[PDB]
Amino acid sequence: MYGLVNKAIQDMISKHHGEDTWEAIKQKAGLEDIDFFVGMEAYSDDVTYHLVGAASEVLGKPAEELLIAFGEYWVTYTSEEGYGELLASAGDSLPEFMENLDNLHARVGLSFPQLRPPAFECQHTSSKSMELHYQSTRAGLAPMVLGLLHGLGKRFQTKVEVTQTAFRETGEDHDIFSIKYE
Amino acid sequence: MYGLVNKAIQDMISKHHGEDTWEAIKQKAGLEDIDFFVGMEAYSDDVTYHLVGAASEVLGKPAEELLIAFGEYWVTYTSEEGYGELLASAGDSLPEFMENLDNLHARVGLSFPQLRPPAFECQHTSSKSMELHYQSTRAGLAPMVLGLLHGLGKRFQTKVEVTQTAFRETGEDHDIFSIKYE
Ligand code: HEM
Ligand code: HEM
């Protein structure tokens, strides 16, 4: 995944637990050499898995818990590190924002040629509820999707309830989340 | 499971989709003969699974979604059909409520001698997060746990974020959920 994602993790851990903590994770993660991550360059997905892993260990939190937190953090980080306009253009409400996500990730893909974005389909079951389908070339990130949705809820001052109803990691075709929102 | 659970299910479907809908489910579920469920008497778990299975068909919702909705309904239903005091004595916050949950079910067990209550262990990873272990003599109810958790969030005016990180149904030892809450 592009360095942006890894800068963001790093940013999150450093603001929340400081540079030493970060350095520890960095060290444990096997990446002592990387001086700084390059936003617009593509790294191996491993760099991210190891980072998450190392943070799990150093912080005594399951990885999934960290993915959730990284997920809602990402909504703030992007609004402030140069994608706020792009974010805003993608919707004025959660359900609109989710319908526009594939599009958002395509506008991003222009600037980022090796992007493997996720694919998201929304099936509205009511004007306050939807069933969100997440499809991905990667495994393990469903918990991040969940944090992102909670991030978007805070952004649009909207209360949101999210429960994952189907799982890839077992052998269901893709992750589905049932969502309820004001 | 004791009749209470099945009354609550009925009560939920009747209040939300009317008696004619409930009656269709009752019929399809193969239980036309049962006039009313007896709260404090024990039924076979089948009754509940057939009940759940039927509501899925009649309503055209996956079972998992119904469980999740049943799970949050239960929190209200119990507060009003005679377990409000007991509910309230069990905590003034989510993390406290979950720590006292085994005790709650033991108190209940004094009244319901054939109860097979689930067992719930909390490992607090921070003052805003935990790793929740749910152990049960039964399979398939993890989604219900997820609704119950959202139900307790509303009760204590607390945003909660839940992802299941392990699954009985695959042959992991028990269900584990990673939880973040205000
Ligand atoms: C708003 C600005 C956003 C930007 C600039 C952005 C950009 C990106 C980038 C660069 C990646 C890495 C992909 C790769 O390296 O192959 C990515 C991945 C991802 N993005 Fe976003 N994104 C944004 C918003 C969102 C939101 C709001 C969500 C969810 C609601 C989302 C969901 C994801 C997911 C789930 C992935 C993981 C990739 C995967 O599943 O394989 N993104 N995004
Ligand atoms: C006043 C509150 C409550 C009462 C009176 C109550 C009572 C019961 C009863 C009677 C059963 C049926 C078990 C059997 O028939 O053998 C049961 C099952 C269950 N209860 Fe509760 N309960 C309460 C609150 C909660 C809460 C708040 C949760 C939240 C997670 C919970 C989780 C469960 C679960 C998961 C089961 C399924 C049994 C299993 O997994 O084996 N209960 N409870």
UniProtKB/TrEMBL annotation, chains A, B:
Heme b binds at residues 2, 74, 105, 116, 134, 136, 138. The keyword Lipoprotein does not apply. Keywords: Heme, Iron, Metal-binding. It comes from the Bacteria. The keyword Membrane does not apply. This is Alr2278 protein.
